[PDB]
Amino acid sequence: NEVTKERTAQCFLRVDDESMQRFHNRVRQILMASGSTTFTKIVNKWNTALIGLMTYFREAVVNTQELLDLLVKCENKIQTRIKIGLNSKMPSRFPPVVFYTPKELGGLGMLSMGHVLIPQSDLRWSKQTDVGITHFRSGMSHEEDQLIPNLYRYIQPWESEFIDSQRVWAEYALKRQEAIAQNRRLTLEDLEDSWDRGIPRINTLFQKDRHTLAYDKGWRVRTDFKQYQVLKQNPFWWTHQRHDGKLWNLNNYRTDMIQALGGVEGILEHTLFKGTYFPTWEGLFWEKASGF
């Protein structure tokens, strides 16, 4: 309550059944339209759908156990489709490093909203030096088999989002009102701690086209109605990256996914990288398409 400032009510959230049906339909049409389609395109479509669902319905997944089951089922569907694409026979002990490797390291970079364990035997690599060939494991920790980080923990809940947004906007208002008097523009220096916090993300204040965007009105309604003009459904039908900013950061998720897989060294041990005899992994780049 805004007067008693007490916990007068409790709000339980859930993902609507229509939204779950729409997500399942989107995954089904992703999969069935994959007879002649690259694996990376399929994984990117799945990743886009998953981030749209999880960012839109954060705090509402946890209470919808049916949604968790549907999510893991669809992720298994995607993995099965990719595995069938590789070979026309189901692998028995397929490893997760192929799917959950970031695309720059050659992997598919699929986002996992589930629970996938990496077998310990897949966290060992070997390196040849002048003395001989030495073997390395990934972690000194004596725990269960490594679990890839779950996207669940890498999205801040809406309640925290709104509280943080209110605090950040109050701080920004105070800074602006105390900087008008001394006559200095906010120069990105004091607005560094509160960088990706407010719902109209502070990055939008410093956006390049921040003047021409101010005359763009009714953009949420236009984004929602865009489904009647473009042949492709938009997972982010509700927000605009330019107007609203980026509401989710995958830097930490991908950081911990690289960390969990044993790092670049182990991931490349799973690959042909050492078979290329490249002295290091730093000064290298990919090429998406060949000349022909």
Binding site: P95, G114, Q156, N249
Partner: peptide
């Protein structure tokens, strides 16, 4: 070690959503 994705229903309730993020 099967390579299949497991459903995290009834799992990892000791962790929040705002954790492991700065």
């Amino acid at each position: 070690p099967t390579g299949e994705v497991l459903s995290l229903v009834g799992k990892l309730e000791g962790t929040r959503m705002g954790d492991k993020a700065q």
